[model samples]
Target: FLPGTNVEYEDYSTFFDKFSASGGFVLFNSNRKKYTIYNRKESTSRFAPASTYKVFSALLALESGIITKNDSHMTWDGTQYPYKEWNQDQDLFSAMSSSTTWYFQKLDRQIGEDHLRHYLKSIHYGNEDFSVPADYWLDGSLQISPLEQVNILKKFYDNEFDFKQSNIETVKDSIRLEESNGRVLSGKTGTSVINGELHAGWFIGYVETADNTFFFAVHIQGEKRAAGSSAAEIALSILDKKGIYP
Candidate 1:
């Protein structure tokens, strides 16, 4: 997965052709400028990050000392969260691991505008070449090109994005659990809801082999029931073919 130019090597065209029809994609290597595919955006566009953005919020919380890796923020207080259906309490780590929407809304309130905006601006997380609007996160506002997702993962891997190692590790750990690839991959799955339907599914993270680092993000838009395992299975197939395991 060499980066910079979008060459779309012949061997990967089959996958790209099909994946393109499904949804947008973003992938990158450490030193590259863009993805291996040259025509990603023309094929697909970025939608809401959904629960995936929880990591960003968590990073801010930890950096600001509002929460710690071991903090027990969610405990099933037996109350319902506003505009949220699942009303169980949980800590940052568990909330992230479970993709709990209500927990994040609570965290969002704690973060408020001042701190959240500070982190967003400090990181320049979205619409890079152009300026992003102030309320990008409130609705389906923030956008990320396939190329952008690659860079964000690179920053997260290099510890340059923000957040302490412990906090970052906690968040990363919650992304996913993959035992294949002869190692582990930490990633978050995203589902974008559009008009009462899930518009996209995402699996983004890095594969570690104790010696090499490969960062990737995959998105698949489909029925909600087909989101989780479907996206995960597709990503594993690619990694397996890439010899991520052995």
Candidate 2:
């Protein structure tokens, strides 16, 4: 049977006490075939994916030959703006880490509207609406629920997308976040701000051990001070309390 996927409400109120955001969390434990979820209502509500879309973007780009490898570099266009780190050339790892808009935007453009749409629909991605390929993930046209986010992540992590293993591994390698105490954490963060106010945020990824791989997605929405880091922090605390990670 397909993994018995369902959402079970868990209290996460205290977790968000430090910040002014409301969001959802979903954790799927493969080994135990169990799931733990918080903020049930919003966890199933679709919202802009923001930078979390990069995970799939990287996979599609590499599988389609838009990029050769995780470190394949693209030259900067000498454009000046915020985020000094993005002003230089970047590859998969650096671009993912810095969430460099230009680098992925270039890939987005090169992927083209038709191809992007085809892949999203083919993969059964959330909402599968990339009408504006370049910015749909940010501008609300492309949306996904936290539950949907984790489902796709599990597929990607398990190499169930029929994509080349090498390409999948390359994307996995690029998004790795940390390794400590016999566990490795890998993920990406996305923040959506409108009119200088943070409106949505996300921290989606998985934790790996020699025996188990736990996938999680955290989505947050608020005004001032809401960010990807805050979303990550909330998820981390729950993981710690649950003893999923040390």
lDDT of 2 by residue, 69-132 (tens): 7347899999995889999989888999999988888898998999988988888888888757
Candidates in order, TM-scores: namely: 0.78, 0.94
In model 2, where is the ten-residue run with the lowest total lDDT? Answer: 1-10
What does candidate 1's lDDT look like per residue over 19-89, in tens digits? 33254344454444434433465224555555666777677777777777667476666776553535655
Q: Locate the minimum summed-lDDT window of 10 residues in model 1.
A: 128-137
| Full-model lDDT, candidate 1 | 0.60
How does model 2 score by TM-score?
0.94
Alpha carbon lDDT of residue 99, candidate 1?
A: 73
Please give the lDDT score at residue 100 for candidate 2: 97
